[PDB]
UniProtKB/Swiss-Prot annotation, chains A, B:
The organism's place on the tree of life at top rank: Viruses
Start and end residues of each PLD phosphodiesterase domain: 302-329
Recorded topology in the membrane: Lipid-anchor
Hydrolase in keyword set: yes
Keyword terms: Host endoplasmic reticulum, Host Golgi apparatus, Host membrane, Host-virus interaction, Hydrolase, Late protein, Lipoprotein, Membrane, Palmitate, Viral budding, Viral budding via the host ESCRT complexes, Viral envelope protein, Viral release from host cell, Virion
Annotated SMART domains: PLDc
Quaternary organization: Interacts with protein OPG190/B5.
Protein name: Envelope phospholipase OPG057
Amino acid sequence: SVPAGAKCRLVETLPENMDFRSDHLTTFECFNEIITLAKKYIYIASFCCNPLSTTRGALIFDKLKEASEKGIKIIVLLDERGKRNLGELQSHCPDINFITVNIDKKNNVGLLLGCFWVSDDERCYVGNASFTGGSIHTIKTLGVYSDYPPLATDLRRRFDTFKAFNSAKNSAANLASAAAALPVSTAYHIKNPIGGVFFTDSPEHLLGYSRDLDTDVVIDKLKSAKTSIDIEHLAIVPTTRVDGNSYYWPDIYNSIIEAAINRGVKIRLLVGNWDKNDVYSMATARSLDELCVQNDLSVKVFTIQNNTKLLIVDDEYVHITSANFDGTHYQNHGFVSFNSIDKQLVSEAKKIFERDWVSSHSKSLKI
Amino acid sequence: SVPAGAKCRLVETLPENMDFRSDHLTTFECFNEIITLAKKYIYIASFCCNPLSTTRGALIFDKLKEASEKGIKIIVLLDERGKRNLGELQSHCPDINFITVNIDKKNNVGLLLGCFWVSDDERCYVGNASFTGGSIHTIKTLGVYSDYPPLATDLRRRFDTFKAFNSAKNSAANLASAAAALPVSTAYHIKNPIGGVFFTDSPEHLLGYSRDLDTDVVIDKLKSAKTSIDIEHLAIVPTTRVDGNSYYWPDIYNSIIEAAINRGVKIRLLVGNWDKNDVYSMATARSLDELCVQNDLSVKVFTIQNNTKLLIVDDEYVHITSANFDGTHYQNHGFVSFNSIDKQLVSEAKKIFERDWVSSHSKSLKI
């Protein structure tokens, strides 16, 4: 029999200078457990890699360094745009294999986000805490840890896809014959979760033929919501700026408003602070602000460094990811999203959002 | 050979107390020509019917009364909600057949708009001037008149569909066996225009299997725009209020903004004046207002009585209708939309919009 929730438990970074408290496994504790128990390999994938920026981050790096010296195969995937620290990392850990990834050499827009650890096809972390000293120590993050081998193995398959886009000679990033020959496998989708847990993936041109596009799963859940929608992301604006020109993409923005206006769903949005240099965020805010007076919409903003990407629907579905609900991410960026419908696990996530909602770092939107 | 533009010419109501001028056929002149030349029938369809409210409207009614007395079959279709004047109309013209229509007895939301005349399968008017004294004399309207029999005949087929929803015993509005047995025919669609002209229809549950849904044609044109989008409607808000609760529907609203932000299309919106009792129009305005500073979007408002429903795309496509670009209309209401890709006819419509844009009755949106 498979255990309910697939042995998943929440993981978060609660910095000392912030009022967030919990009894959950800290990110620092989590990464320490993965290294300590590792016997074969440790695979890590995040956009940036800069462990030496904080005290706890550097301790994780030394534990990882000690593991690589004891015979553990350590592979760290980072996007080619987090390449600055690469020389510093290799000089500190000459036995760890660092690989720069470019999942989009056709248009140079798609970025690798990860954001996960996996080891021995048994243990894994997935969430929004990059392999940086900030995400381990000083920045609020949220993730999930499971020591269930069937689930961790399915996460390792996501690592196989990303590693194929290394910037070296014939690869899935430089040739089309080696990219179309990539088995982009997955054992569990939304159609067949494992103990109520399943992964969704992105972007669409890396799905293969069996993986679920995170865009479709997220939107379907938002459209199927019957009572509540709680979201803690960085921004829920329908417009994002890729390099020079702006990009309009209201797919998620509409599914939220549609739930509030057409179906009377109670919605609480905990997003980043708006800025005046981009006035277009104010209009999007004033549009969301006015829907709070008769529709069951509510908006609070935070200014702290916070990587949390959390979605909870009707206390029956929880979505923890590393991407933000916007067009640039959900159409170009490469990430894997944690999904669970386990009642007990969703309950623990609802407890997290309630805490964050009434935190001193969450102020009601005023314009 | 078929004539380019299908012998279509623009028709508008330019009230004396407004600064609009043109050499086009006035609505009053148009309705007079249809009656004067009629030899077999005159079919009229609009939401309301109240010709006696103005001087010119009453003159049209007397001409129509004189026609019905000379043996012309006169049928006037009005929605069952414009039923107040029905007794007054029948007492003035006992030989005209007035028929109340209910195109939606399942949910009692869909309304008959028309909005057109057709006679002898030869001449027709289509536009936004209802059979009311206001639309004939004192309210700004815009429409098209053609004496091309193949085009007028295709418009009469739209009248056959609407007449079937009379509120009397077994009909397409009271039974399902008589509604599914309705040949909802059309001779010309967007796939095969006649001289560059074709009709689109609404709602979807009255399309049959050959007619084009106006919703899809309008959105496709807005998405295919490469240079300019000019619109003169009553409102382009993504939210409308049906009876008690509100209804969110941003399909057209998004296709316009997407054209401006993603494709740099120059857009000019001439819409009705926003109100403070519905603050949600202000937020939609402030969202459109801020997109005017870097994107090629522009918004002006009018307070005059104006039924004009005009869309022009890239000076290659013109869309004149009686419905407004919102969710309530394009998903429930029964109307027929004039579409033309004739360069000369689109040119005359562009001249109309340029006039209206710089009219004294069009003020730039300020919030």
